[PDB]
Amino acid sequence: MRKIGIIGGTFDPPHYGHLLIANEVYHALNLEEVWFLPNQIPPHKQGRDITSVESRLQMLELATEAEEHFSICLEELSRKGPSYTYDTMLQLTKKYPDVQFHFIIGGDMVEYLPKWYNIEALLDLVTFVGVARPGYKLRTPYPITTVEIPEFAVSSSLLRERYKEKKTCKYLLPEKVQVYIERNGLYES
Amino acid sequence: MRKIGIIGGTFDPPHYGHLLIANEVYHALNLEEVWFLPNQIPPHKQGRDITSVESRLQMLELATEAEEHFSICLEELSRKGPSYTYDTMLQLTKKYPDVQFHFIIGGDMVEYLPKWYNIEALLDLVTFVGVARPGYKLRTPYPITTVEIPEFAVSSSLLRERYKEKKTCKYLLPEKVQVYIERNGLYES
């Protein structure tokens, strides 16, 4: 069974929190690759002024081009939204029967797994990996694998807020991505 | 007065934990400078090979170069043997009575404040700044200024450990610093 880690999110924009987690679990659990699964844009959701999936893909490409082991998974973008993880993992599970997928989540999403659609069936399809800081233990009734990580508490929403409020983004996400954001004036301006 | 930030530590090695913190608080509280104040490490009697103040100072200089607003304070390295924060601030206060220092510490270090040497006197010399993840509150009996930050839970000790057991260090500390570590074989050979 090939071990491939999956990291979901909007990647609007992608940041060192995404890369840090991918690299850590990739090593801790000896995975083959880690795939970044962009979310499809939700309906009604920002049918206003927001990033096109096209720009997210570009930044995501800028952020992962230097790693042969990190690749993009357009599975959720292949269908119209919203995207349920279960349905999504069902498909990757039929396209890649030789793979034991590891769905990776931040320490704080763990308490919300009960609200995920079909979580019990989903736990049959993939093996959940929860990321936590040294010594802190993840509590949940679902089987999860914990991987101690020098966690970076940055997020795409914090980054979007900051680009508008014209705040600092230093050390938060890849420079190449930052250049992309400014050249195209995303969020900022 | 001109407000200056202070971050103490071994910086053995200096890492992105430190830089992020200084840049986050430098912007949050509008400081005009942040000072990196390296501690003096005494010789472990049961014998333990530790980095020379020489190379640690070079590592500190490597990670501090590019930032005009980041400097090294050599006050603790000027005394023989490690000194208490109180004593160091007594000297910095009298040496720069025009400055109001902001001693920056990790939110998780906050609870241990009551056990600090002369903390009652220290509270009047400097202004404590506790750094924490957004939303988290800093329970403490002392008047601390809290600043929400996308906290990077990396530590010098966690690093010395990755290098020894040959674990990954990616995104954990600056490029130049790793280059210097690899050469002189600081935590390996």
Ligand SMILES: [Co+2]
């Ligand atoms: Co700035």
Ligand SMILES: [Co+2]
């Ligand atoms: Co590696």
